[PDB]
Amino acid sequence: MISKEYHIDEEVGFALPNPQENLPDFYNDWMFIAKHLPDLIESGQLRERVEKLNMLSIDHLTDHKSQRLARLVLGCITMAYVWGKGHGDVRKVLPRNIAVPYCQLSKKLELPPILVYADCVLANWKKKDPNKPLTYENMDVLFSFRDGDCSKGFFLVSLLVEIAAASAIKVIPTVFKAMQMQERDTLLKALLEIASCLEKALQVFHQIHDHVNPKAFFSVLRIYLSGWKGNPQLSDGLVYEGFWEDPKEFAGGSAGQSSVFQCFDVLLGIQQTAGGGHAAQFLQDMRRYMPPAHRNFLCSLESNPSVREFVLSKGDAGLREAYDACVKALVSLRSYHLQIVTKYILIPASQQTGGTDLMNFLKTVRSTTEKSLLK
Ligand code: HEM
Numbered sequence: 001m002i003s004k005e006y007h008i009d010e011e012v013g014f015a016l017p018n019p020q021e022n023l024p025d026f027y028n029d030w031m032f033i034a035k036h037l038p039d040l041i042e043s044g045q046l047r048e049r050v051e052k053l054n055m056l057s058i059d060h061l062t063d064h065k066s067q068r069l070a071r072l073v074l075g076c077i078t079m080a081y082v083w084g085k086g087h088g089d090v091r092k093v094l095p096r097n098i099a100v101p102y103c104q105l106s107k108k109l110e111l112p113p114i115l116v117y118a119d120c121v122l123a124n125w126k127k128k129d130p131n132k133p134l135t136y137e138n139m140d141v142l143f144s145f146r147d148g149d150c151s152k153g154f155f156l157v158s159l160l161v162e163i164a165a166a167s168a169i170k171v172i173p174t175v176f177k178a179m180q181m182q183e184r185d186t187l188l189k190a191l192l193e194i195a196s197c198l199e200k201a202l203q204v205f206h207q208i209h210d211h212v213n214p215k216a217f218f219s220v221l222r223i224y225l226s227g228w229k230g231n232p233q234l235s236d237g238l239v240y241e242g243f244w245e246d247p248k249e250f251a252g253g254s255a256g257q258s259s260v261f262q263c264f265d266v267l268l269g270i271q272q273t274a275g276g277g278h279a280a281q282f283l284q285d286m287r288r289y290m291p292p293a294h295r296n297f298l299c300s301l302e303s304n305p306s307v308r309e310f311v312l313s314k315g316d317a318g319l320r321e322a323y324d325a326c327v328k329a330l331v332s333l334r335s336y337h338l339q340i341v342t343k344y345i346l347i348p349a350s351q352q353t354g355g356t357d358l359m360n361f362l363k364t365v366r367s368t369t370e371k372s373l374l375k
């Protein structure tokens, strides 16, 4: 079993299990704004209401779940304040009374002061009925931006792919213990289970089409998840007033900030973060947007002996085929992901070189996965 320090749940994996919905009464002013972003943004009163906040201390966020909720709350409020109605008028300064506590909490959790995948997917959910299982119909998100923004479909399908992958993650200690104890049969079984689970994760991905509309994502939801690293709208980044004097750059939310695909890249010896290209650079930089416990886990998998080199050294077709099934499952996820990028970015953008450059980046990562096949 995985060590408690890494914050990996048996059921939900890298997701925060049963995350908090309500903060203490102390932070009701934060909560009212974040719960009513659709109306507040539409009516153009969000920014005024953010500006008229008092600075609330982060000391009354006592445990990890409450601190994670606060990040999600302040994260969503921050994106609403920056992007406004999502029509091009941007705020270049985040006000003192929200920026300071958001930055203090962010330093405490070792995350950047911007909404990340870990906020808006991994901590942004609940069960409708606690006695029923983790399915779309029994689940809801905690926070959305605009009416018709498809954020429930968008965040929960990502979460459900994330949860599907958790079943493979709990096998990882079996993989390594089987290698050191020279348990061939155990290792093969473990690889066939990981492949099975990553194949299941692809079928969960199919649900995106049912619950997320292309126009709604591209025209609205993508605007609010946008960051301010290399963004012409905020050339120099965002001024976090009273915490830093100069404006800081931070990347927007992405499932590239997921620890799932990186975890199995590392496990399988798919050297994605090697080579020194844009792919490698991006994927390593994205680890800074993961929770510290999760990047520590990825660091620990890299420190372990190579599964790839173990399977190559044995002259064992069954193990090679079980290993290739895991790699091929990752290739399939990435192949399917490209089709989603086509539907959800490329076509809406055309209806409105970067598009070619984007697809070639993703194809490079997939090509590096494909190259790790043994036969
Ligand atoms: C509306 C649907 C989606 C769109 C339009 C989309 C788009 C993109 C884009 C443009 C990138 C390149 C990185 C960047 O520009 O920051 C990317 C990377 C990535 N995406 Fe998505 N994505 C979607 C859904 C998902 C989902 C649900 C997952 C799985 C949870 C996922 C997994 C990944 C991963 C792991 C990367 C990093 C590159 C890699 O490892 O292949 N994406 N995505």
Ligand SMILES: CC(=O)NCCSc1nonc1/C(=N/O)N[C@H]1Cc2ccc(F)cc21
Pocket (backbone or CB within 6 Å): 116, 117, 120, 121, 154, 155, 158, 222, 223, 225, 226, 227, 252, 253, 254, 255, 256, 257
């Ligand atoms: C918002 C923006 O422009 N980000 C930089 C470009 S990457 C991107 N865009 O939009 N979606 C992206 C995605 N990249 O893996 N997966 C989707 C799935 C998901 C969950 C949370 C999130 F916050 C994003 C996503």
